């Protein structure tokens, strides 16, 4: 049995921590909703 609990407002935070790169990838999406890399 699943239940939900509130964790916060959805807002933009000024001066939030900034990280992560920005890859451009060729991918495929199958009928099961899974992405795979196309090479």
């Amino acid at each position: 049995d699943m239940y939900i609990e509130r964790a916060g407002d959805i807002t933009w935070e000024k001066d939030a921590e900034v990280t992560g790169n920005s890859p451009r990838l060729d991918v495929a999406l199958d009928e099961s909703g899974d992405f795979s890399l196309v090479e």
Partner: protein, 156 residues
């Protein structure tokens, strides 16, 4: 139950203790999460019951109590924020510039941020605080790094 707009944890007591299986967004009285978090099962909010209304396995999305309401889209140029809600931890904003998933059917924004699986359903937001999609359906690339699509539904 609680119907206030915001981000929520999706929990279960079926396994050991209380386990977080995912996250979702309450907006305009509709609860939005990824299909793989709930598998389309009913949910509880306090003593209230939320029944599935719409879902699609290929989009990996599901809405409860009404149709999908989130319609904002990544502008393709600006940084966004993932409002990550990891299991056992406080909600935290992480800012990033999305990459892109290029598919035979068009391009989708993607975020190269790696969180535990129970963070799936956490919202990705623009500078106005609009939800542009949900985190948690993605791929593992060459490096072994995880990259999530910015998955958004369609508001009918």
């Amino acid at each position: 139950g609680e119907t206030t707009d915001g981000v929520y944890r999706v929990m279960t007591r079926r396994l050991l203790g209380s386990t977080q299986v995912g996250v979702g967004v309450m907006q305009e009285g509709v609860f939005h999460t990824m299909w793989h978090v709930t598998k389309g099962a009913a949910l509880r909010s306090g003593e209230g019951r939320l029944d599935p209304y719409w879902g699609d396995v290929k989009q990996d999305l599901v809405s409860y109590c009404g149709p999908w309401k989130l319609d904002a889209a990544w502008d393709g140029l600006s940084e966004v924020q993932l409002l990550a809600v990891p299991p056992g931890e406080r909600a935290k904003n992480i800012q990033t510039l999305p990459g892109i998933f290029k598919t035979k059917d068009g391009d989708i924004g993607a975020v190269a941020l790696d969180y535990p699986a129970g963070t799936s359903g956490s919202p990705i937001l623009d500078k106005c605080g609009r939800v542009i999609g949900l985190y948690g359906n993605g791929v593992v690339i060459k490096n072994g790094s995880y990259v999530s699509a910015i998955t958004q539904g369609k508001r009918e």
